[PDB]
Every structure is written in C-alpha cells, then in structure tokens.
C-alpha cells in the first residue's frame, strides 16, 4: 500500500506521544478503549518482532497488514496461533496455554480448574505425543470455527 502506509503513518505519529519513533505499552494504554482489553499485551508482543518491548513503524505496518480483507483463512489462523505461542517457537506449550487463558479468564477459574482443562485440551489435540500443540494440530482443532471471518480491519 502506498497511501495506506501514509495514513497509518498519521495514526502512528499521533500515538507516539514522546515522538520516539516507537510505540511503548504505556502509549497504547493511553487510549481508554484499550485499558480494559486483556489481549493488548499479547498483540503488542506479537507486533514487537525484535523483542525490544516497543513497536517501531515497520513492526506496526506488518502487524496491521495481518488483518486485511485479502488475507486468507490460513493467515488469520496463524495470527490466532501467535496469540497463544508466547515464546514464538512454533509450539503452544502447556504453560503458555495456561498463561494466555489466565489473562482472559481472570478470577473466574481457580488455578487448579484452569490447569485441568489446559491438560485435557492438549491431550485431546496432541496427535504426535510431544505434549505441545503445533500449528497443524491447532488448525485441526479450530478448523471449523470460521474465526478468520471475524479478524478484519479496514486499514
């Protein structure tokens, strides 16, 4: 995108309070509509490709372009997988799946209950027996949900 980058540039500069050239967690948390969204810290971490804790402009572009209308099903499923794969190694481990669910559920489940349903989801979905969930195993489980359809933004 030519003018689509230029328009994103506008919103980027508006968000970059301290004009550093990068967006800090604090700077995303300045928008009040994000303050009660427990997935903001996951989305930032995913956009933050170099792991420095902030989102630079290139990171911002490439992150946002994951949510285009053109994007096919597999690409959206990839983004959803990244939500759970905290360490970015390609496999959702028991600890990761627990921690990410914990962000969303809050106090609604006890730790012991959450751990039990994490274990059972992994056992049921773990076709190759390594105790972790690969992208292939992930797609087999969530394949029929059509959530790709509800992951679109007009950029």
């Amino acid at each position: 995108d030519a003018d689509e980058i230029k328009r994103l540039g506008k919103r980027f500069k508006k968000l970059d309070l301290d004009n550093s050239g990068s967006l800090s967690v604090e700077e995303f948390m300045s928008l009040p509509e994000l303050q009660q969204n427990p997935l903001v810290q996951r989305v930032i971490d995913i956009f933050d490709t170099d792991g420095n804790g902030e989102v630079d402009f290139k990171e911002f572009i490439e992150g946002v372009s994951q949510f285009s209308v053109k994007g096919d099903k597999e690409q959206k499923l990839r983004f959803a997988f990244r939500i759970y794969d905290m360490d970015k190694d390609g496999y959702i481990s028991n600890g990761e799946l627990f921690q990410v669910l914990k962000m969303m559920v809050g106090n609604n489940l006890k730790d012991t209950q959450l751990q039990q349903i994490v274990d059972k989801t992994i056992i049921n979905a773990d076709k190759d027996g390594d105790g972790r969930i690969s992208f292939e195993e992930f797609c087999a489980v969530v394949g029929g949900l059509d959530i790709h359809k509800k992951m679109v933004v007009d950029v």
Binding site: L15, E33, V43, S93, K120, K150, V153
Partner: protein, 357 residues
C-alpha cells in the same frame, strides 16, 4: 516443562489395551481399570467397545424382572459422578463379596458418565450373578442426545461408542424382586401394571416409548402429598416430567397387598438426606415406598448426602455418605481453544479498530 500448576496431576495419554484390561481368562482387571479411570485415562476404543458389548450380551440373557436374594446393597442415581461412585463401593462393600442392585440413571449431568458405564459394565462381566443393573429414564437415546452423554462419547471416544451404549441400554432389565418382598424400579408404578406378570410380559428391547407401562416404570413419581392425599385419584398425569404419572399412597398399597409385597424401593428423585421413607403400610408397619438416591452434592450444588440401602435379614441399614473431589470440565466437554478463540478474535479486532480510529 513450563507447566504452571505443578501440584495438579496430569492425565495419562497412554490408552489401555485389550491385554492390559482383560486377562487371558477373559476377566476384566477392575483394579487396573479403576486406577486408570480415576486419573482420567482412556481405553483404546476397541477395548471400550468390548466391555460394552460383552456386558450387553450378559444383560440380554436376563429377565425383565430380576429375582434377587438378600443380603444386597441397593443404589439409586449416579449420573456420571464417577468419583462418588468410587466412594459408594467403599460405603456399600466390595463387589467381590457384596451383592449389588443399581436402579438406573448412570449417565448425564455428571461429566464422567462413560467412566461410570465402563466400570459398571466391567463389574457386570466379572460378577454376572451378584451385580445387577436396572434401566433408568436416562438410559435411552432421547435423553442422552439432549443432556450430555452423547457429546461425552463424541469428545472422549467416538459415536460408535455412543451407539454401542444405546444398544446395551436397551438390554437393561426394568425391575427386580428383592428377597421376595420388595419391588425395585427406577421410577415406580403404572395404571397398567397390576401384577408382577405384567412386567414379565413387556418387550424391553427398545427405546422406551412416550407412554405405556415401560415408560411408567422408568418415569413415574409419588405425589408430592403422597400419604396425605385429598385426590382420590390413584394415577394422575405427571406434568413435571411431561409423561407418565404421579401415583398415590392408596395406589401403592393396593399393588402391595394384591401382590403380597412389603414395599416399593425406587430412585429418580433427589433427596437431601440421600433417601426418603414414605408413609407406613398399616397392614405391615413398614414404609410403603422408599426413594434411594446415590449422587452426593448433586450437580455440584445440591449439597445433599447420598445413601445406599444395605438390606439384610430383618434390617434395612441406610448408609449415608458425602461427595468427593473430581476434575473440572468446561460445559459440553469444550476444549479451551473453542472456548476462548471467539473472544480472542473479537478482542484483537476491537483493539485494532480503536488504534486505527
């Protein structure tokens, strides 16, 4: 590994094989089965199938109306509460040396119904002459499709395991005459059953019909005001269940004196104490009807005790017990991805909408 709640035990992924479950004499190893199932282990599917169909061939040869000797432990509803069923066997006696009679409703509501069925069917194969299983109103297609059992089988095993259970449930006997004194059934009486011969004549090998004697044995209840009637009606339509009947105290006493019986022992309604004894027969001084209910803390909310009845020459010992811990399951046996993914989808998209706006 990076597993967070270490104290919580992890289910085994190994599925028990045919040689692990059945010894070379054809007998199930119930101790091994009990330990594995308590850990939320699974059997190979062909092994679950073998238990189900071998139990069903034993059930199929039994009569509609069972003839059961004292002493015996009589148990009411279980409803998939496998971990309470483990305690029940401690309270009631080892099946190795105790006669048992279960009155139905093994499945639905509790999230371990297949484990209850696998265990009880395994026990029936091992003790064919001393462990007896009756049909309850849940042991059918119509209810297990609406409640949780069909879904439980789909998620834990497959639909073939479900279909085999449905065929096995069709073979369950409807009633038992215990010590030549008690008629034992899940629900109760019918306006069409005046004698024990009326039970012997039924064709039980089918899905229970929407009305008639088979329906009534599984579904009927005593009147709310049983024993204290001002409705001289023996059988009134059961508007709470939506089929079958409420039966009155005169209805029961009529059946009892006609057939020279002492009492009806039934289950089917939850009880805070785990049992309820109803108005005494005047001819005998003994309760005309007893309800037994063997699911403690029913639905994880009732906070009730469960009980079993240990009947022995001249004494009815009712033994109460409380619930035991069990593992957590999301509604409908949903996995955490299915559960969380829609919310993940909407919350990421919403974040980006607010950022771009």
């Amino acid at each position: 590994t990076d597993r967070v709640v270490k104290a919580v035990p992890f289910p085994p992924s190994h599925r028990l094989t045919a040689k692990e479950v059945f010894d070379n004499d054809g007998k199930p190893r119930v101790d091994i089965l009990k330990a594995h199932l308590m850990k939320e282990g699974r059997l190979e599917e062909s092994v679950a199938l073998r238990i189900i169909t071998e139990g069903a061939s034993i059930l199929r040869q039994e009569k509609n109306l069972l003839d059961i000797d004292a002493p015996v432990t009589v148990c009411g509803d279980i409803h998939g509460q496998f971990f309470d069923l483990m305690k029940l066997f401690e309270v009631g006696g080892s099946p190795a040396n105790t006669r048992y009679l279960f009155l139905g409703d093994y499945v639905d509501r509790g999230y371990f119904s297949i484990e209850c069925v696998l265990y009880l069917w395994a026990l029936k194969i091992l003790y064919p002459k001393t462990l007896f299983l009756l049909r309850g109103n849940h042991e059918c297609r119509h209810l297990t499709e609406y409640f949780t059992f069909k879904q439980e089988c789909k998620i834990k095993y497959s639909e073939r395991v479900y279909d085999a259970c449905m065929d096995a449930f069709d073979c369950l006997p409807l009633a038992a005459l215990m010590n030549q004194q008690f008629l034992c059934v899940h629900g109760g009486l019918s306006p069409e059953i005046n004698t024990l011969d009326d039970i012997r004549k039924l064709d039980r090998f089918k899905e229970p019909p929407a009305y008639g004697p088979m329906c009534d044995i599984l579904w009927s209840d005593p009147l709310e005001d049983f024993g204290n009637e001002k409705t001289q009606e023996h059988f009134t339509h059961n508007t709470v269940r939506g089929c079958s009947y409420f039966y009155s105290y005169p209805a029961v006493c009529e059946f009892l004196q006609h057939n020279n019986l002492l009492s009806i022992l039934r289950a089917h309604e939850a009880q805070d104490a785990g049992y309820r004894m109803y108005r005494k027969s005047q001819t005998t001084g003994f309760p005309s009807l007893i309800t037994i209910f063997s699911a403690p803390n029913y639905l994880d909310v009732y906070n009730n005790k469960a009980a079993v009845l240990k009947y022995e020459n001249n004494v009815m010992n009712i033994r109460q017990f409380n619930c035991s811990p069990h593992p957590y399951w999301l509604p409908n046996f949903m996995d955490v991805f299915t559960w969380s993914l829609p919310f993940v989808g909407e919350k990421v998209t919403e974040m980006l909408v607010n950022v771009l706006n």
